Amino acid sequence: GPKFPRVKNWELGSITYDTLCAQSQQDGPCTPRRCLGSLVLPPAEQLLSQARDFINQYYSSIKRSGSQAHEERLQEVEAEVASTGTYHLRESELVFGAKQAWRNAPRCVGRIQWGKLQVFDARDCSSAQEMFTYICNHIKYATNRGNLRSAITVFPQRAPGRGDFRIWNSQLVRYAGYRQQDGSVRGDPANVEITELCIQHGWTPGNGRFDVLPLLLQAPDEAPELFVLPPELVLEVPLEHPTLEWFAALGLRWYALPAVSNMLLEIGGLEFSAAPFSGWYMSTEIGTRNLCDPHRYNILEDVAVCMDLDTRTTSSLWKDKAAVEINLAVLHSFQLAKVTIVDHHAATVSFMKHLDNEQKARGGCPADWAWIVPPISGSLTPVFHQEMVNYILSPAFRYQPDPW
Amino acid sequence: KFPRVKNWELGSITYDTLCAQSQQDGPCTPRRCLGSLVLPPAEQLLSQARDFINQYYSSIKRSGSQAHEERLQEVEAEVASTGTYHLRESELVFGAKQAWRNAPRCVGRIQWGKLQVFDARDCSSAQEMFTYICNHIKYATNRGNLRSAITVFPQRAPGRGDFRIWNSQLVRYAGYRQQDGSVRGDPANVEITELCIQHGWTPGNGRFDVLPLLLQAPDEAPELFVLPPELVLEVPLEHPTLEWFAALGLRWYALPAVSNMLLEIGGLEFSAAPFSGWYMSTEIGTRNLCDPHRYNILEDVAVCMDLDTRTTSSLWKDKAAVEINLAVLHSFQLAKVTIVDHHAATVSFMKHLDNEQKARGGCPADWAWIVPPISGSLTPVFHQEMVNYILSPAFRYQPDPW
Ligand code: HEM
Ligand code: HEM
Ligand SMILES: Cc1cc(N)nc(C[C@@H]2CNC[C@@H]2OCCNC[C@H](F)c2cccc(F)c2)c1
Ligand SMILES: Cc1cc(N)nc(C[C@@H]2CNC[C@@H]2OCCNC[C@H](F)c2cccc(F)c2)c1
Ligand SMILES: C[C@H](O)[C@H](O)[C@H]1CNc2nc(N)[nH]c(=O)c2N1
Ligand SMILES: C[C@H](O)[C@H](O)[C@H]1CNc2nc(N)[nH]c(=O)c2N1
Ligand SMILES: [Zn+2]
């Protein structure tokens, strides 16, 4: 074979070679001396080359590469940068770039849907209040009464010497976490800081386990402003189990819409610091991570006690049994409420199909094995047996640290 | 420089300084991570030897002593004269424990200091290899109270062919290709099964037929030896509450004993150095029995359980897999054969990480192999960042001798 990584599937015995990785223009965290693949967090000339690359990508995607229109677009970007230090994307370039950032996201198992993204252009937005309107519109469109639709809303890009548009919440919908007297947390321990920041900015807190947080929205050079989401906009699913009738009595619930709001969207060197996007859940993120992580709702022991399991010994597999029934409750309850969700089996099957599609279309697919393999039943899914190459392509979504 | 390593469940952070001791490159580069891939003169030999002898004298806290100086000179003298050298038994013992300590894919490393090392470097024939292997099996098995062991056969030499065990483990079950392209037994072992038959083995026809060994002395065809049945401890699988489970006729062998890896110590290479510990239950219950390309029993079990098999969203696979893992643990516990479940194994691995942080400043670990194949995030290792790199002494994969 060629001098590109050989990639094997150990279940089926099949082999491919990744040639797409040659397109990577940004270094990850590994060296020949040590692999850091498991870590969670790993100028005019600089901008212009990122821009040219992106414009080349766009004209390739419309098959007008080398054309007069292509060359004129490049010259227009260069002159814009020459005189202003920055440039602006055409509407169709933004749409292409946003779908490409999703396509490029190594940690996303849902990429078979990448071409079906509704891109809302909010680059005219000039205030926190207007961000709120755009965000409520996104939530209404995306939620679609339970028939969820993938979407992204793009606020204005970072600009020379002017502050950023930022949504302070890590997602559009999250539950509060309230630090208690005895040191415990009521609600979601992941959200203790943001919850405290909201109270500080004038929110009157609740006292429940599942209280929806308000949004803290920041327009350039202003303190963030607080906006409560009208409860009729936030679709939630009370959790019940198909055969364990007591499960409904636990009063657990989750919201319908997974909407990430703290990632930076980079396209051609331009940085969109507020560009919240949403899809639909894969059930394990709720049933396994949100509900069972020891540092989250941590409900395994409660549920195992209800199931009458022996929680005194590891080898009864009480944690495994309880996690499975909680995951089944999530799926059953979303299906009952007619809210789009995908189980880990169906999601990883569709990601294997996406891998094949991309092998044909671009000669590989950047993928992060530790994130793509689900957190229960790993080797029961086809992705566990599939070698994966991880690398950074642009356009991309990047993590940004909390603005506080 | 030194990477920061975070645990996301507890918020705790360490810095890995051990990785600076790596002298051998892995498959990653700044352009792309290949961490998920399964497969990767006299002066170079001399410096590996020196490093190793330095490691050894450091472990017995005699660095710089007279014995240390004179041993270094012995190695130099031997290499300069002959191109190679030989380890003393106590060095071999230290080196074997260290290759285990260093193995990034092993979750069982809390046990690394406890290893019985059989010196088989005076072995000159496949016959003698067989006797040594039978003794290792008897020792390691110990009527079910398993004891970690390694037997080390003669090192590679520039002149000649290697000592090799053709089998990938000392105990494995045959896989017989059928006329309909079906496999009876373990589909992972079709090739070795067919090799045994072509070297004169009379095959069984069951699902759990223990394979004979193909053992190879230098520059000879391999020879076939059948393991005496009484040496091979097996565990019938039954379930604590599902009565019909026992009637599936399932079983697994007690002793996991890897026989195809190369042991590298101080630049010397031991191409046959089979080692054994005890099983982590998910290896049997999840991979061997539920992999689609292995015994693939999930659907049969789920149907016996009367689960709805038609749709993924009933989580019938997840349910059946849990019960199969439970059957494995219950049955080994019942037979009084050492086994460890994935929760206990991963908790002890976390302690090993803390011990190693204190002892050496880090611990090379391969997250994709450390995290178990069921209930990943239910175990503490899922939430633990890991740094992967190659330290020597080391175990290395070697391709099949045919
Ligand atoms: C259509 C349904 C979708 C499904 C089922 C899905 C599935 C997932 C899952 C399970 C994860 C891992 C999340 C975690 O553990 O934190 C993930 C990550 C991610 N997905 Fe998707 N995805 C979907 C849509 C989207 C969309 C619309 C975008 C953007 C346009 C997106 C981009 C990303 C990114 C950037 C990550 C990494 C997040 C991070 O680093 O925290 N995905 N996806
Ligand atoms: C004491 C009981 C032990 C337990 C519970 C244990 C656990 C494990 C597990 C679960 C794996 C992954 C197996 C797989 O998925 O193929 C593994 C791999 C490995 N272990 Fe251990 N281990 C034990 C003892 C040992 C010993 C005694 C040695 C050598 C002296 C050793 C060296 C290795 C090596 C080199 C690998 C990687 C094997 C490969 O690449 O195929 N371990 N261990
Ligand atoms: C520190 C840090 C880095 C990073 N890259 N990421 C994070 C968010 C963490 C990752 N793991 C839990 C939490 O992220 C929770 C949010 N995940 C929802 C998911 F991204 C999703 C699902 C379906 C559709 C869709 F559009 C989006 C934190
Ligand atoms: C191609 C290739 C490369 C590589 N490094 N490795 C392999 C063996 C594979 C790994 N995954 C299944 C199979 O290896 C099965 C052997 N595993 C037994 C396990 F290693 C074990 C457990 C407890 C104690 C002990 F001493 C040994 C194949
Ligand atoms: C340490 C490790 O990288 C970390 O816990 C990762 C593992 N895999 C994951 N996979 C997904 N999809 N989401 C996550 O939050 C994590 N956490
Ligand atoms: C492709 C992927 O690396 C491969 O399936 C790995 C993943 N993790 C593993 N983990 C262990 N312990 N054993 C294995 O064989 C594997 N296989
Ligand atoms: Zn890597």
One domain, residues B22 and B152: yes
Q: How far apart are CA A257 and CA A146, in angstroms?
A: 9
Residue B290: which CATH number? 3.90.1230.10
How many angstroms separate the CA atoms of B255 and A184, rounded?
45
Whole-number Å distance between alpha carbons of B400 and B382: 32
Q: Which of A39, A108, A266 to mutate to test the pocket of ligand 1 (most atoms within 8 A of CB)?
A: A108
Considering the domain architecture, whether residues A138 and A119 belong to the same structural domain is answered as no
User: Are residues B327 and B236 in contact, defined by beta-carbon separation less than 8 angstroms?
Assistant: no
With residue B236 as reference, give the H or E element that holds it. Answer: strand B234-236
Virtual torsion, Cα A27, A33, A34, A37, nearest 10 deg: 30
Report the sign of the C-alpha dihedral through residues A323, A326, A331, A334, in that order. Answer: negative
Spacing of C-alpha B333 from chain mean position: 22
Q: In terms of domains, do B267 and B154 share one?
A: yes
d(CA B53, CA B58): 8
Rounded distance between C-alpha atoms, residue B35 and residue A388, angstroms = 8
Do A227 and A108 lie in one domain? The reply is no
Query: Between helices A68-84 and A44-61, what is the axis angle to 10°?
Result: 160
Ramachandran angles phi, psi of A178, nearest 5°: -110, 115
In a shared domain, residues A338 and A357: no
Residue B97 within a domain: yes
Structural domain contains residue B109: yes
Asked if residues A30 and B35 have their Cβ atoms less than 8 Å apart, the reply is yes
Task: Verify that B54 and B68 share a domain, yes or no.
Answer: yes
- Which two tokens mark A38? 């498991």
Instruction: Note if A365 is an active site residue.
Output: no
B391 within domain boundaries: no
Q: Is A280 annotated as a binding residue?
A: yes
Query: What is the DSSP track for B291-338?
Result: -TTTT--HHHHHHHTT---S-GGG-HHHHHHHHHHHHHHHHHHHHT--
Q: In this structure, are B35 and B92 located in the same domain?
A: yes
CATH code of residue A97:
3.90.340.10
The helix-helix angle for B42-59 and B89-101 (nearest 10°) equals 90
Residues A115 and A28 in one domain: yes
Structural domain contains residue B202? yes
Q: Is residue A186 within 8 Å of residue A207, measured between CB atoms?
A: yes
Q: Which of B104, B110, B114, B192 is nearest to B150 (CA)?
A: B114
Q: Which domain holds residue B316?
A: 234-256+279-344
Helices (H) and strands (E) counted in chain B, each on its own, are 11, 16
Q: Residue B182: phi, psi to the nearest 5? A: -65, 155
User: The domain that contains B216 carries what CATH number?
Assistant: 3.90.440.10
What is the position in ligand 2's atom list of the atom closest to the CA of B115? Answer: 27
Q: What angle (nearest 5°) sits at the alpha carbon of residue A183, between those of residues A177 and A185?
A: 20
Residue A398 and residue A271 in contact, taking contact as beta carbons nearer than 8 Å: no
B131 CB-side CA count, 13 A: 8
The number of residues making up chain A comes to: 404
**Rounded to the nearest 10 degrees, how much is the dihedral formed by the CA atoms of B84, B88, B93, B97?**
-40
Contact B377 A288 (CB under 8 A): yes
Going by C-alpha positions, the residue among A400, A93, A102 that lies closest to residue A273 is A400
Q: Whose CA is nearest to atom 22 of ligand 4?
A: B279
A324: nearest CB among B25, B26, B318:
B318
Other C-beta atoms closer than 10 Å to the C-beta of B334 total: 13
* Nearest residue to B331 via CA among B216, B251, B219, B242: B251
Give dist(CA A301, CA A323) in Å, integer.
Answer: 10
Residue B294 inside a domain? The answer is: yes
Chain A residues with CB under 8 Å of B28 CB are 30-32, 34-35, 37
Strand partners, A152: A119, A277
DSSP per-residue letters across B169-206: BSS-B-EEE-TTS-EEE-GGGHHHHHHHHHTT-----S
Q: Is B219 exposed, middle or buried (0-12, 13-18, 19+ CB in 10 A)?
A: exposed
Instruction: Please check whether residue B389 lies inside any domain of the structure.
Output: no
| B205 domain-assigned | yes
- In the chain, the amino acid numbered A113 is Q
Give B106 Cα–ligand 2 centroid separation in angstroms. Answer: 4
Contacts of residue A121, Cβ cutoff 8 Å, sequence gap at least 6: A91, A94, A154
Q: Is B145 helix (H, G, I), strand (E, B) or coil?
A: coil
Give the number of residues written for chain B: 402
Torsion angles phi and psi, residue B397, rounded to 5: -65, 140
Q: What angle do CA B301, B304, B310 make, to 5 degrees?
A: 80
Q: Which residues line ligand 3 (CB under 6 A)?
A: A 40-41, 110, 171, 258, 260, 277-279, 281, 285, 399
Q: Tally the domains of chain B.
A: 3
Residues B271 and B362 in one domain: yes
Preferred mutation among B6, B17, B34, B332 to probe A, highest tally of A CBs within 10 A = B34
The encoded tokens of residue B251 equal 């079983």
- For residues B400 and B397, give the distance between their C-alpha atoms in angstroms, rounded to a whole number: 9
Q: From CA B54, how far away is CA B64, in angstroms rounded?
A: 9
* 3-state secondary structure at position B279: coil
Assigned token pair, A144: 């679609």
Integer Rg of chain A from CA: 23
What is the C-alpha separation between A90 and B164, in angstroms, rounded? 65
Q: Do B247 and B328 sit in the same domain of this protein?
A: yes
Domain identity same for A195 and A248: no
Q: Is residue A385 part of a domain?
A: no
> CA B385 to CA B13: how far, in whole Å?
9
Which residues touch B235 (CB under 8 Å, ≥6 apart)? B251, B252, B253, B254, B331, B332, B335, B337
Q: Which residues contact B206 (CB under 8 A, 6 or more apart)?
A: B184, B185
- What element of type H or E holds B92? helix B89-101
Active site residue A111: yes
Same domain, B210 and B169: yes
SS (H, E, C) chain A: CCCCCEEEECCCCCEEECCHHHHCCECCCCCCCCECCCCCCCCHHHHHHHHHHHHHHHHHHCCCCCCHHHHHHHHHHHHHHHHHCCCCCCHHHHHHHHHHHHHHCCCCCCHHHCCCCEEEECCCCCCHHHHHHHHHHHHHHHHHHHCCCCEEEECCCCECCECCCEECCCECCCECEEECCCCCEEECHHHHHHHHHHHHCCCCCCCCCCCECCEEEECCCCCCEEECCCHHHCCEEECCCCCCHHHHHHCCEEECCCEECCEEEEECCEEECCCCEECCEEHHHHHHHHHHCCCCCCCHHHHHHHCCCCCCCHHHCHHHHHHHHHHHHHHHHHHHCCCCEECHHHHHHHHHHHHHHHHHHHCCCECCHHHHCCCCCHHHCHHHHECCEECECCCEEEECCCCC
